[PDB]
N, CA, C and O atoms as a Tinker XYZ file with bonds, in Angstrom:
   392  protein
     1  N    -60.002000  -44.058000  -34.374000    73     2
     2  CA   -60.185000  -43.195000  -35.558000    64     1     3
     3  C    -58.851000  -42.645000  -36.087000    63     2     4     5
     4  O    -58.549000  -42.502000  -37.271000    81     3
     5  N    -58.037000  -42.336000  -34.908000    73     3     6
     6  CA   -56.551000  -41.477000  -35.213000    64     5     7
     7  C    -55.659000  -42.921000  -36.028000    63     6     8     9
     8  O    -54.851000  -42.508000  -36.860000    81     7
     9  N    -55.688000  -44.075000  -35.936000    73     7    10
    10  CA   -55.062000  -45.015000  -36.122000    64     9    11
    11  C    -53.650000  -45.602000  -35.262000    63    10    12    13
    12  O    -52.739000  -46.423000  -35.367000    81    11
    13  N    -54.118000  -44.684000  -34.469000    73    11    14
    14  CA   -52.937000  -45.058000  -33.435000    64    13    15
    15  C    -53.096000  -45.495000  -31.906000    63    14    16    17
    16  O    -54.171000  -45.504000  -31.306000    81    15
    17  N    -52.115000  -45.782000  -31.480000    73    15    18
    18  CA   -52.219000  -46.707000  -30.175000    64    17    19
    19  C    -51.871000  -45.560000  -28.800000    63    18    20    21
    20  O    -51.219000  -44.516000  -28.824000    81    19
    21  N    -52.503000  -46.152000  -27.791000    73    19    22
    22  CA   -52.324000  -45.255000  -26.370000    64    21    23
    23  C    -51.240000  -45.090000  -26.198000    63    22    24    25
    24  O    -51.139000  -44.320000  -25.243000    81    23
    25  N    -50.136000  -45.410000  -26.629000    73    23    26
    26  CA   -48.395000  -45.286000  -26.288000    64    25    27
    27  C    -48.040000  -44.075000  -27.276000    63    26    28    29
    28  O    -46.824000  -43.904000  -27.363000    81    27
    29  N    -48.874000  -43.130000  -28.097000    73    27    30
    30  CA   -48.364000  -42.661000  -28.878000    64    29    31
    31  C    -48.154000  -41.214000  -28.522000    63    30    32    33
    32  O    -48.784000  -40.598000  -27.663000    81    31
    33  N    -47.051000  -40.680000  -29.397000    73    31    34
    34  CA   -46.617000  -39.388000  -28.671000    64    33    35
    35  C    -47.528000  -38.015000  -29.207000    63    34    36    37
    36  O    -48.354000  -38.308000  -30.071000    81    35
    37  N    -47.502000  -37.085000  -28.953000    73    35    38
    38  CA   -48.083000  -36.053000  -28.887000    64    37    39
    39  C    -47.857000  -35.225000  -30.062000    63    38    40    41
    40  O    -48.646000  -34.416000  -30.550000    81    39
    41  N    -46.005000  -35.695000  -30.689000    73    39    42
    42  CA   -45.730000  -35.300000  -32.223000    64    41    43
    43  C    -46.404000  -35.840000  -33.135000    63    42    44    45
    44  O    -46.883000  -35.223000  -34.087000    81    43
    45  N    -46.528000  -37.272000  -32.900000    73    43    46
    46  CA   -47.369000  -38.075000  -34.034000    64    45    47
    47  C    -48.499000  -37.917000  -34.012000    63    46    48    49
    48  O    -49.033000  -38.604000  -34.883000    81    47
    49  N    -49.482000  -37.096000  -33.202000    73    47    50
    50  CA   -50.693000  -36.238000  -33.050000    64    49    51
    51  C    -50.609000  -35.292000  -34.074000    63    50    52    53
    52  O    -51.400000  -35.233000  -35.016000    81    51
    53  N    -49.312000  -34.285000  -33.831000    73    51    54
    54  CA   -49.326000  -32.524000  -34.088000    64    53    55
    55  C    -49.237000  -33.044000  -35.953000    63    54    56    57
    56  O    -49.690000  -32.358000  -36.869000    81    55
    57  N    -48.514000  -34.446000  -36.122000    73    55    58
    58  CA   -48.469000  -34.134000  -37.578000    64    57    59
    59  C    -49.394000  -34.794000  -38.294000    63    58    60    61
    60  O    -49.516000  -34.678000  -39.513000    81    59
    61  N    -50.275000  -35.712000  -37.372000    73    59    62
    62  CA   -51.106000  -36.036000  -37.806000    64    61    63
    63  C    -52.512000  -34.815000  -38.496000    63    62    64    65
    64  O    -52.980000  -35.009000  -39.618000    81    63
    65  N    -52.966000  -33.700000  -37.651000    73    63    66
    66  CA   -53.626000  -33.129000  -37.920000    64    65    67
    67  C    -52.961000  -31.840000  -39.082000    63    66    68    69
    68  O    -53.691000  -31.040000  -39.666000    81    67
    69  N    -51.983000  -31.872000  -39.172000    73    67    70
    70  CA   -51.262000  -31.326000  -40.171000    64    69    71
    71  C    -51.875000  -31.976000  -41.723000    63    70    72    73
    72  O    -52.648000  -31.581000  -42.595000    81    71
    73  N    -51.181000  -32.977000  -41.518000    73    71    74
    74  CA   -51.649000  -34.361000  -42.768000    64    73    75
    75  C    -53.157000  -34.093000  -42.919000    63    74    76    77
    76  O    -53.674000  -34.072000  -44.036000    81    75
    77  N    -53.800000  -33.907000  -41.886000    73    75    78
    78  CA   -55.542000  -34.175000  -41.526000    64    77    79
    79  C    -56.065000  -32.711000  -42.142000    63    78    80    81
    80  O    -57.246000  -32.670000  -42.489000    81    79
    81  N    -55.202000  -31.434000  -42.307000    73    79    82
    82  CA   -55.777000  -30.591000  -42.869000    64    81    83
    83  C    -55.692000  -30.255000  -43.889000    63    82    84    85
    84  O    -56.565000  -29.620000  -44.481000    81    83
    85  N    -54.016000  -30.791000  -44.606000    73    83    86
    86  CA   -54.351000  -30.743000  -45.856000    64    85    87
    87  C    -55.168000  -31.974000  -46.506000    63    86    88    89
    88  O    -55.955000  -31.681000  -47.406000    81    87
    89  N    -55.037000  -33.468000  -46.087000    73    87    90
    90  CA   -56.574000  -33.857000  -46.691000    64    89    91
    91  C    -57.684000  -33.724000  -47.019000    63    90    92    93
    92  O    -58.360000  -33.859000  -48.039000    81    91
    93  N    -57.885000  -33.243000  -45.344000    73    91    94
    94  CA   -59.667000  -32.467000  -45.213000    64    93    95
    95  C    -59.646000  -31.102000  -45.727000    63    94    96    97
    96  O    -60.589000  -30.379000  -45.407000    81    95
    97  N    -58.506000  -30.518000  -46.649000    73    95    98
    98  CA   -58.627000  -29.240000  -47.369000    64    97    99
    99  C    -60.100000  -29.206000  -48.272000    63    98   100   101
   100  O    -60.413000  -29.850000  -49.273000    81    99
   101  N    -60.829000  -28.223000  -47.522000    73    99   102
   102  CA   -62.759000  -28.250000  -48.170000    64   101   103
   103  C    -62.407000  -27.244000  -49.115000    63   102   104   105
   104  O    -62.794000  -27.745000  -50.171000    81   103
   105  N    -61.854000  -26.002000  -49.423000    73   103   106
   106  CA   -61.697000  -25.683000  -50.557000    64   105   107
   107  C    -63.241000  -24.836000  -51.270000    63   106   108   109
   108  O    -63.424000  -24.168000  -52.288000    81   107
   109  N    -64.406000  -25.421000  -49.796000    73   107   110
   110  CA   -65.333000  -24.995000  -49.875000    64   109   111
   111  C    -66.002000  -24.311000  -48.651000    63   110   112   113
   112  O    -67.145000  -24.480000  -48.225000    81   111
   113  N    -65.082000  -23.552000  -48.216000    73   111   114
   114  CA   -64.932000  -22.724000  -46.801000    64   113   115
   115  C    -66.611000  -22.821000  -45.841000    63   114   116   117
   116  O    -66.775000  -23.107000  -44.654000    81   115
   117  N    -67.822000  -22.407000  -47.064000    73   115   118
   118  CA   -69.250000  -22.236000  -46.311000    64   117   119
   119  C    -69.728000  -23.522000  -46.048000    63   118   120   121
   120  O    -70.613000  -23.748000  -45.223000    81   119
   121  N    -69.092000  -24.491000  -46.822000    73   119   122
   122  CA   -69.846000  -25.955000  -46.409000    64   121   123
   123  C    -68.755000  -27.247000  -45.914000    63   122   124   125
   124  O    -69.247000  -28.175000  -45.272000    81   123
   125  N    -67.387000  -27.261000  -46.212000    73   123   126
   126  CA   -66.912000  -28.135000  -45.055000    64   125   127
   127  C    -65.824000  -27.307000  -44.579000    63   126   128   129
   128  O    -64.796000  -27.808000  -44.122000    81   127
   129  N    -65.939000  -26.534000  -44.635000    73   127   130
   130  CA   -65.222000  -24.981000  -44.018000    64   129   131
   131  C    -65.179000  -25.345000  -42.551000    63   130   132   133
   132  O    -64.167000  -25.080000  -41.902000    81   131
   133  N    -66.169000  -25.910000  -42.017000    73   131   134
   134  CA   -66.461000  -25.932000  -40.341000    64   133   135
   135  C    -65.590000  -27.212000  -40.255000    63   134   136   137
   136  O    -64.625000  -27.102000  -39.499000    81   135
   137  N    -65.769000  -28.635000  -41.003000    73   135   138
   138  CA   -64.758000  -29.335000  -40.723000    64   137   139
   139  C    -63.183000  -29.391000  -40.946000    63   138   140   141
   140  O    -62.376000  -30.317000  -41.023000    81   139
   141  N    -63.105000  -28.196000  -41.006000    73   139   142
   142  CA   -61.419000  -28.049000  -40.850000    64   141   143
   143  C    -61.077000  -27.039000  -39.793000    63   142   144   145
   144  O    -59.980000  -26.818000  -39.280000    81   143
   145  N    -62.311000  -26.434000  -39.559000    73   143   146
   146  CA   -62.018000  -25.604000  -38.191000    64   145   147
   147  C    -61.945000  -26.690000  -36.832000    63   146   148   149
   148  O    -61.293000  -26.464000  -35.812000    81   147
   149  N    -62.547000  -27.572000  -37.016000    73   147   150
   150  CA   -62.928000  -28.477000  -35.995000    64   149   151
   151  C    -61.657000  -28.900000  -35.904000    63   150   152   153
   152  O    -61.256000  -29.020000  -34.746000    81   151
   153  N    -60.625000  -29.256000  -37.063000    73   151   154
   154  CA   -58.961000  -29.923000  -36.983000    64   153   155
   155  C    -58.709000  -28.907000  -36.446000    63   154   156   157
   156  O    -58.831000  -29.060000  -35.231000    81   155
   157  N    -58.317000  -27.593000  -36.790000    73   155   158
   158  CA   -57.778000  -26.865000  -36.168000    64   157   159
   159  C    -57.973000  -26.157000  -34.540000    63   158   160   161
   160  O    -57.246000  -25.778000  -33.622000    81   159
   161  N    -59.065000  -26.232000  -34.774000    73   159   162
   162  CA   -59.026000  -25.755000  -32.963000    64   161   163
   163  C    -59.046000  -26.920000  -32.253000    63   162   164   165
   164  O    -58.762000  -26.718000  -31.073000    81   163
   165  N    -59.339000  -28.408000  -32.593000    73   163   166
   166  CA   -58.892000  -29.849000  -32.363000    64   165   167
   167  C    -57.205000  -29.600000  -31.912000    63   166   168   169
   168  O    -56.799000  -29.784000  -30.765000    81   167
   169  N    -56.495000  -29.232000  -32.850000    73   167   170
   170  CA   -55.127000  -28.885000  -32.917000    64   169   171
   171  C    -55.111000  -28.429000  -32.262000    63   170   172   173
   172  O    -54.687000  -29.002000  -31.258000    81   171
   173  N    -55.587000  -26.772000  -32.087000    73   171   174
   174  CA   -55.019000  -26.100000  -30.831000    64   173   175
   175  C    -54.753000  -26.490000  -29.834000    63   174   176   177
   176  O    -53.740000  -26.358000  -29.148000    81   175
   177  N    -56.219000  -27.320000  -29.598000    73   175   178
   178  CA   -56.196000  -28.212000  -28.008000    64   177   179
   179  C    -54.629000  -28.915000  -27.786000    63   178   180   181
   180  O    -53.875000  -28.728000  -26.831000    81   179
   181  N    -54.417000  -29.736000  -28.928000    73   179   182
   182  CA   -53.180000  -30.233000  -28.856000    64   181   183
   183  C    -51.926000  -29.412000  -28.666000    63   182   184   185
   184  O    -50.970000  -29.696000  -27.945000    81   183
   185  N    -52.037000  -28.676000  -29.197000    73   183   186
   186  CA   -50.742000  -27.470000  -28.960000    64   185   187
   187  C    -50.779000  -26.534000  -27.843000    63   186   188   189
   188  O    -49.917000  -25.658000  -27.764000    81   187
   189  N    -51.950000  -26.673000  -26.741000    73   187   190
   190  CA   -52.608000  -26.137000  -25.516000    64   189   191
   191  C    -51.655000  -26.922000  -24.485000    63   190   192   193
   192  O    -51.756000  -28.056000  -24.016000    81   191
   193  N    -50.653000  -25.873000  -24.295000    73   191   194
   194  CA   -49.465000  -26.651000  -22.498000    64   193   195
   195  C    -50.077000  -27.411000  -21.756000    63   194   196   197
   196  O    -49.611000  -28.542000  -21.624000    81   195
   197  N    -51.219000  -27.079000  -21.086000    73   195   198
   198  CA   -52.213000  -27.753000  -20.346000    64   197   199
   199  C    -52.326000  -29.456000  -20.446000    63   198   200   201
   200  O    -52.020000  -30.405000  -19.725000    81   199
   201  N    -53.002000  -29.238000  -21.883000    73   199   202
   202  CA   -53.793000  -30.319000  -22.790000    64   201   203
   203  C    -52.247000  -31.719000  -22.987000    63   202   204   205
   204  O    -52.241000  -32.946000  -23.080000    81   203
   205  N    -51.397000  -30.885000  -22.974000    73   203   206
   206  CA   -49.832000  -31.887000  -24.076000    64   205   207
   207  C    -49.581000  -32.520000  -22.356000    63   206   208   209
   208  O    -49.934000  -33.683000  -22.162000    81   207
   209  N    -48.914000  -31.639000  -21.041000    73   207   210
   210  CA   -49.024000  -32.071000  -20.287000    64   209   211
   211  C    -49.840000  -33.253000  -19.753000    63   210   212   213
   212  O    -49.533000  -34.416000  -19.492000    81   211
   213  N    -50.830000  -32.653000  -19.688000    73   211   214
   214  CA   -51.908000  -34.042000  -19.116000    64   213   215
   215  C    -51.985000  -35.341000  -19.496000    63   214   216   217
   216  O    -52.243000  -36.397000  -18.919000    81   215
   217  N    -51.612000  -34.916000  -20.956000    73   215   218
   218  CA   -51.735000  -36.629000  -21.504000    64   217   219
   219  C    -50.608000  -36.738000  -21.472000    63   218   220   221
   220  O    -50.461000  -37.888000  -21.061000    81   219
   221  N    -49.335000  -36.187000  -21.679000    73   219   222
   222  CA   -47.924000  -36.645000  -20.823000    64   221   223
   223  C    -47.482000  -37.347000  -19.922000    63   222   224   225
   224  O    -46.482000  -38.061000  -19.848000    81   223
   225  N    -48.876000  -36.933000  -18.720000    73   223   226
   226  CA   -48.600000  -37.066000  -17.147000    64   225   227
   227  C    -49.251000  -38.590000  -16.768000    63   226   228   229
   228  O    -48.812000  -39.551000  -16.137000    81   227
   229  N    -50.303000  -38.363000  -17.355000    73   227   230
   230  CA   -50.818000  -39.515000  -16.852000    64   229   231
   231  C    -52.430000  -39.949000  -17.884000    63   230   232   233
   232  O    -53.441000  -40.413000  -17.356000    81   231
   233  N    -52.288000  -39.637000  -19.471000    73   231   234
   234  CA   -53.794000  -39.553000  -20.026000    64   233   235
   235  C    -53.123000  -40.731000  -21.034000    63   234   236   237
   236  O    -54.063000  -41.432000  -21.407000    81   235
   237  N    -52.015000  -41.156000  -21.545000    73   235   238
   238  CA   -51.935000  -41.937000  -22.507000    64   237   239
   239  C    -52.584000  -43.413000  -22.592000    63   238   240   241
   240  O    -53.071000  -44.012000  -23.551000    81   239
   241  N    -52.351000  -43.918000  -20.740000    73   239   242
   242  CA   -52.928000  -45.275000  -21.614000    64   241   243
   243  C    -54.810000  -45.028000  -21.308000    63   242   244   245
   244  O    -55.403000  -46.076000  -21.053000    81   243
   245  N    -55.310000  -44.278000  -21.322000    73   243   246
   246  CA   -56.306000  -44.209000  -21.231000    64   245   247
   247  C    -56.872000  -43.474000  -22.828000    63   246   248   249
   248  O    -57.959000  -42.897000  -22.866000    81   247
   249  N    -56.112000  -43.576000  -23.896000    73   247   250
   250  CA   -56.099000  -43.153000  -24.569000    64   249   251
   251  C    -56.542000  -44.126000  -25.727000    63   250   252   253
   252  O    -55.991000  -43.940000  -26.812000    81   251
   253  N    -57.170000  -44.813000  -25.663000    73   251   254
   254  CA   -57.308000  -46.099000  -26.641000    64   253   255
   255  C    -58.824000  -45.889000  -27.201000    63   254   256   257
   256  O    -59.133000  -46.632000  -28.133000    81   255
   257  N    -59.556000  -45.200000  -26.860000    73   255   258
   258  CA   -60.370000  -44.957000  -27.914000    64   257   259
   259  C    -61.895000  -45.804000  -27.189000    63   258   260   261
   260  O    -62.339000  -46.651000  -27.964000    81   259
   261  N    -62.706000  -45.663000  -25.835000    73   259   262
   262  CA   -63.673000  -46.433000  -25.393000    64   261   263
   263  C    -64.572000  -46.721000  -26.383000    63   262   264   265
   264  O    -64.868000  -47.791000  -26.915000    81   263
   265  N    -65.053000  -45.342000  -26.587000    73   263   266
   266  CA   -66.570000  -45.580000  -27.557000    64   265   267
   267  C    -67.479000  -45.841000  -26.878000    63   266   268   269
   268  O    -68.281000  -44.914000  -26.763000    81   267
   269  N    -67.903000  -47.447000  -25.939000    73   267   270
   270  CA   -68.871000  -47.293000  -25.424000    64   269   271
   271  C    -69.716000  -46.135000  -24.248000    63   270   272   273
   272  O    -69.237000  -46.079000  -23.116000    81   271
   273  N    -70.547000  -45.541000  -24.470000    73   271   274
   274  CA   -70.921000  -44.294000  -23.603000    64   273   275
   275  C    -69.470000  -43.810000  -22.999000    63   274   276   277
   276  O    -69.299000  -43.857000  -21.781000    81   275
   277  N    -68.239000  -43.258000  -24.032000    73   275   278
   278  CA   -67.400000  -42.501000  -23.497000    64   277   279
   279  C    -67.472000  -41.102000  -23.700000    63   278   280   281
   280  O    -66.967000  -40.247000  -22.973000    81   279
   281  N    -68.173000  -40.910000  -24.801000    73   279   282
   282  CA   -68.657000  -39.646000  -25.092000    64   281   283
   283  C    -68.427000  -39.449000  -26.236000    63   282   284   285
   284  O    -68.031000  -38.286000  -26.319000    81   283
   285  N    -68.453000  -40.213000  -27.808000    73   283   286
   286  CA   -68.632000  -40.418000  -28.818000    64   285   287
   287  C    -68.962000  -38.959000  -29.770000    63   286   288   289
   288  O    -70.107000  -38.524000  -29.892000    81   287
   289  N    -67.560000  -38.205000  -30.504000    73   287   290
   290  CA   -68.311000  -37.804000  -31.380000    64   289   291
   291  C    -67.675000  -37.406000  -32.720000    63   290   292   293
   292  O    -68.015000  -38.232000  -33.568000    81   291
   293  N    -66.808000  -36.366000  -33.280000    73   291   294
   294  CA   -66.315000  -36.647000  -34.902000    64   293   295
   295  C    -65.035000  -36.917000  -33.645000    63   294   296   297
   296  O    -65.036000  -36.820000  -32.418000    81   295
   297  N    -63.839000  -37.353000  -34.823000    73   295   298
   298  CA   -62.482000  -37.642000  -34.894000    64   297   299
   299  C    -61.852000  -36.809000  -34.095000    63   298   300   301
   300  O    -61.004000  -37.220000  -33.302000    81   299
   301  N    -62.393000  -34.717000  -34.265000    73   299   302
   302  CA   -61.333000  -34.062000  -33.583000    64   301   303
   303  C    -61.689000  -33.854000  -32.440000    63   302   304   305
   304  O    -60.998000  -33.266000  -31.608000    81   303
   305  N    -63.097000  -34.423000  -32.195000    73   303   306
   306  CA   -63.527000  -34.004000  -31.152000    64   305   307
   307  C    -62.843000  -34.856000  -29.576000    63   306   308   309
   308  O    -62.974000  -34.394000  -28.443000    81   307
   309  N    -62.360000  -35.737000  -29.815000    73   307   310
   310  CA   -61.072000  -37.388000  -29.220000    64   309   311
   311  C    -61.133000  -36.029000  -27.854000    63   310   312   313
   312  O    -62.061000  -36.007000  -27.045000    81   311
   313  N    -60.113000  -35.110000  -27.832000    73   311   314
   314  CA   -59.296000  -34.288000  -26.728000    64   313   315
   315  C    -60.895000  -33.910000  -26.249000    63   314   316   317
   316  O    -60.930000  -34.258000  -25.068000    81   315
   317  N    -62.209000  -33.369000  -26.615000    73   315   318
   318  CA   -63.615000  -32.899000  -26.021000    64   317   319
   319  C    -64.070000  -33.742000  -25.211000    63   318   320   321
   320  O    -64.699000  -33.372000  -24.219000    81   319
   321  N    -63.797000  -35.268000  -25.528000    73   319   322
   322  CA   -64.490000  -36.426000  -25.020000    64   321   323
   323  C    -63.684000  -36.489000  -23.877000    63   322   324   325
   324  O    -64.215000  -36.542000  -22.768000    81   323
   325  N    -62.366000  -36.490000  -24.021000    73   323   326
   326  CA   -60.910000  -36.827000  -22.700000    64   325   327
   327  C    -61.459000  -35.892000  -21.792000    63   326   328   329
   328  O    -62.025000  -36.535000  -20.908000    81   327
   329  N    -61.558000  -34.673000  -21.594000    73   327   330
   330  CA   -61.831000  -33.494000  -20.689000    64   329   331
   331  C    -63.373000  -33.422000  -20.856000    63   330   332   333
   332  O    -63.453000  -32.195000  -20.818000    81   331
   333  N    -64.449000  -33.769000  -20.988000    73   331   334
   334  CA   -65.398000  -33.513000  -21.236000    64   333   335
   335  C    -66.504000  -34.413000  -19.822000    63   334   336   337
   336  O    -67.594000  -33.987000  -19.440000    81   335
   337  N    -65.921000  -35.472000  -19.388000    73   335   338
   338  CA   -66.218000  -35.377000  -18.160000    64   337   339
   339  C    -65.956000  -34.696000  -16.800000    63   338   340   341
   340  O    -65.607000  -35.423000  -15.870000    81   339
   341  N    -66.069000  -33.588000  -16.629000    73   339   342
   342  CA   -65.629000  -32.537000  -15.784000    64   341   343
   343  C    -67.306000  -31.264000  -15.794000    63   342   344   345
   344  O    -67.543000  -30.129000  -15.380000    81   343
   345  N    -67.840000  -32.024000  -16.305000    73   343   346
   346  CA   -69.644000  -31.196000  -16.659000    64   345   347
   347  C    -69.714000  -30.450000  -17.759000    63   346   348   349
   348  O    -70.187000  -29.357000  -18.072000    81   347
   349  N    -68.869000  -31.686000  -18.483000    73   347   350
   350  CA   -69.397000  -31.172000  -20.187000    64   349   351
   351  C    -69.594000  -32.480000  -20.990000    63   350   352   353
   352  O    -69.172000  -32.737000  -22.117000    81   351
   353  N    -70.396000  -33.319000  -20.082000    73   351   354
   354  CA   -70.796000  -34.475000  -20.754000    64   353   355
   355  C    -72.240000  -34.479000  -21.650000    63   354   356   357
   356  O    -72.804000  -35.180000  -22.490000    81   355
   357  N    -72.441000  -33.276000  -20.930000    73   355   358
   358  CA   -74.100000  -33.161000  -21.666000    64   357   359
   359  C    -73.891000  -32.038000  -22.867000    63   358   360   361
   360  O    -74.823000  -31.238000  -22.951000    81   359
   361  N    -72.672000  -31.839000  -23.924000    73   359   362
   362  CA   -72.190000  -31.340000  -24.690000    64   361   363
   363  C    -72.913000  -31.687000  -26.034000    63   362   364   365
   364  O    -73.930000  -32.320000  -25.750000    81   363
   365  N    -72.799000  -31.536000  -27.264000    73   363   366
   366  CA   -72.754000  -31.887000  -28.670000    64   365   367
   367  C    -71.603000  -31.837000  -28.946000    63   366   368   369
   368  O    -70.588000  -31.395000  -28.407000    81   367
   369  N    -72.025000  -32.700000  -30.511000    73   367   370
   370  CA   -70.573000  -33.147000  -31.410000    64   369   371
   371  C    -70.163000  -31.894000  -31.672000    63   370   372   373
   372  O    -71.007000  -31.029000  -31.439000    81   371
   373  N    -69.111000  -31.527000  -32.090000    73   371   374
   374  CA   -68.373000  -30.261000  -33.054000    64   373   375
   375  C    -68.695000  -30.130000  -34.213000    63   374   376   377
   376  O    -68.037000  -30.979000  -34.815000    81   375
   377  N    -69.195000  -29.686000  -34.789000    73   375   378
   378  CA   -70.026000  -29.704000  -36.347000    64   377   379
   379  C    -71.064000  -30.396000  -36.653000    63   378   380   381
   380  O    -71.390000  -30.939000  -37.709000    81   379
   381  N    -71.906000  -30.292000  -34.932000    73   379   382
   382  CA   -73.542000  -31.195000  -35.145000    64   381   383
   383  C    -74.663000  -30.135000  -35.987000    63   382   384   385
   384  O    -75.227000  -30.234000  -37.076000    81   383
   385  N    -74.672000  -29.180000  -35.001000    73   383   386
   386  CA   -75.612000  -28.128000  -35.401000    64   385   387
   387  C    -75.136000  -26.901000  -35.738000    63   386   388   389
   388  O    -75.910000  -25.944000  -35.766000    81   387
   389  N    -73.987000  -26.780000  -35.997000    73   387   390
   390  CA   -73.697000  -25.562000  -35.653000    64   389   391
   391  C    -74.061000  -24.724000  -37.024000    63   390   392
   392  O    -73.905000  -23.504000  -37.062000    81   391
């Protein structure tokens, strides 16, 4: 979805969702208002020491995007799905119901 490959760095992430918010600028705060919160706290994750580490250390080449039953859900949700086997597989998408 990101268009990029498991070798990729963590800057070409941070400016990606940069780019990703002024695109997805909704402009209509009550109705895609939630999908730009989803970039941004998406982002945070990325800008989270923890989160930059890990895929530093050892999360990149696992980073290619499964899909099959990997835990499938919007674009920012990528970092929910990575950490989300740890007993948060039985989760929802980020802007399913909310």
């Amino acid at each position: 979805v990101l268009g990029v490959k498991p070798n990729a760095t963590q800057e070409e992430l941070k400016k990606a969702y940069r780019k990703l918010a002024l695109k997805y600028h909704p402009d209509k705060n009550p109705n895609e208002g939630e999908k730009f919160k989803q970039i941004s706290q998406a982002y945070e994750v990325l800008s989270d020491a923890k989160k930059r580490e890990l895929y530093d250390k050892g999360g990149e080449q696992a980073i290619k995007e499964g899909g099959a039953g990997g835990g499938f859900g919007s674009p920012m949700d990528i970092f929910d799905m990575f950490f989300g086997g740890g007993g948060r597989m039985q989760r929802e998408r980020r802007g399913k119901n909310v």
